[PDB]
Symmetry: C4
Subunit: 189 residues, 4 copies
């Protein structure tokens, strides 16, 4: 239960930090809920652990932890396993809370998001859920966000930066077509 204790002590610091800065009670509970949803009572120095392993072990772990995500998207499901692994390795797990603005219209976009679980509202009005992704337009155009995207419910997502996006596509150039298709179709709508 060393991981449980790590979470408890770390959360104690967070609580004291919020108290020190006199954050409102409502925000403190929002923080409380975020930690439960995001870490679920346990914490590990993930970077330290994966860093002690080797490439093969790290790739098997990410492929397993993302099995759900992978199964939910034709993008990864029907692709070269090596492509999927390269992509998955670059993903960053993120949890957003109801009402959170994940993307704001008109700003410079430098990341896209893959939905593991949750519902988002795209407003320029439409919704996207499990197995869908968004924010790909700006990674392709390098322009400004074409719409705002807010979390409707709690959202468990994986983000990918434009730099990592292009890095992976350097090795798998033809996979860019998948994102472009989705981008074009949405730009038309």
């Amino acid at each position: 239960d060393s991981s449980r204790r790590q979470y408890q002590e770390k959360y104690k610091q967070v609580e004291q930090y919020m108290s020190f800065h006199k954050l409102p009670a409502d925000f403190r509970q929002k923080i409380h809920d975020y930690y439960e949803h995001r870490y679920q009572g346990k914490m590990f120095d993930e970077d330290s652990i994966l860093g002690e392993l080797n490439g093969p072990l790290r790739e098997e772990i990410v492929n397993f932890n993302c099995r759900k995500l992978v199964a939910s998207m034709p993008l990864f499901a029907n692709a070269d396993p090596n492509f999927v692994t390269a992509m998955l390795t670059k993903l960053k797990f993120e949890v957003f809370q109801p009402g959170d603005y994940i993307i704001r219209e008109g700003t410079i976009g430098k990341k896209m998001y893959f939905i593991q679980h949750g519902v988002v509202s795209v407003l320029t009005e439409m919704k996207l859920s499990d197995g869908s992704y968004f924010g790909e337009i700006c990674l392709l155009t390098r322009g400004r966000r074409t719409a705002s995207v807010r979390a409707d419910t709690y959202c468990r997502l994986y983000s990918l930066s434009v730099d990592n996006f292009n890095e992976v596509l350097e090795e798998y150039p033809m996979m860019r077509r998948a994102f472009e298709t989705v981008a074009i179709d949405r730009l038309d709508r």
Copy 2:
């Protein structure tokens, strides 16, 4: 009180460090006073805490912690909330002590400062206080400091590097005019 203990133990190391290097008694008290003013008896690995959160949570925290600063300046008060947030996110909190040279005339300037609280003396003689900023000239010209700026009283400031300054303005180009106006007006004087 884990944060209180962190401060106490950390300060113990500092004291032992100053003793090891035989720093004068007067400087040791200056160090003592600095820690009280800067951390106020508590310490947190701020980077670790904010890093465990998400973008929305981090932005709400910085906007709240800087509410005072924001209210004191037409620059931020009357601007696009997204601009203010982008700027605030790049700021670095710093505390200076009476007599400290924040900026020395003739040197290459790579940062500007926003005054949360305190009084500074600009010498090439004038003073600046709460709600004012300085050091913007060099971020705009990339030249040498046009004057020295010393802390008159204890000063609670937020600094912004030229690189972060230009990064934010890449997204909000027109806000550069605000800094230029102040710069031009002061260059004339």
Copy 3:
């Protein structure tokens, strides 16, 4: 036995991490075996220790820890001691398990491997063991891997990135010929 305890507590976290993510029992034992083979019951913040030393001490340590490796290869054995040291300093120790894909054919190669102990199978069928190296072709061509290389037995290797490879050769340009010879000979086969 502070190092033994470090290993035990660290492994406890790993085990809890694997449990948290519900990894299969078989993979958990694979992880168990990896840690035994790689760290052998002890762990040290190697980077912190070597960083407290100086250049001379670090170089003597790496030359000693790699004495076995050096003796097993004409490349290093008959070369300028300064070259060997520069190279050794850039190496990264890695342990692979039976069946592990060290290199996959057709992918972009950015590293080569020197075999301290173990047997690998090169498949485009041949094997390489103690004292041999592989993955040098892509560091020279900057192209795609000409074959896959799987660990046949447990493998104790030292990897070298293309960037560190070229950095060392900036100081020892003529040593590139050794790698080219091996590359040409294998490309012919």
Copy 4:
């Protein structure tokens, strides 16, 4: 005595590390002596401590800790205090042991050394001591070391990288002449 304990526990790890890698008894005592000379029974996360301070405090500390060094050289003694501070801030304290090769002839030089205390032998035969510096030729030519420099006695030095060297001179261009004079005079000899 938290700093004393830090040293004791850290040294315990070092000793266990050397034992794990089966380093010879003679080298283990060399390591033992190095730690005593370099840290003197105490250790602090220097980077963490100085990082908690501000620019003014850090500059006063470095100027004080290097008071001895500064007094021993016309270079710094008769220069602009701001130049001295900028330089001192970039220095890295290093301890070398008798017989250590600080610089090897013919290699690419990327750093120079200022002697706080100790004696070095320059061999292409001459010696340099307290208040003198060496390794400046390569920082100026970007070529290969014109000679080897070995520690004759224990040496307490401060090194400066070519990059930091040129960075400081960007602000103080005319100080480069001081190093060139010494370089030219030695190249003639």
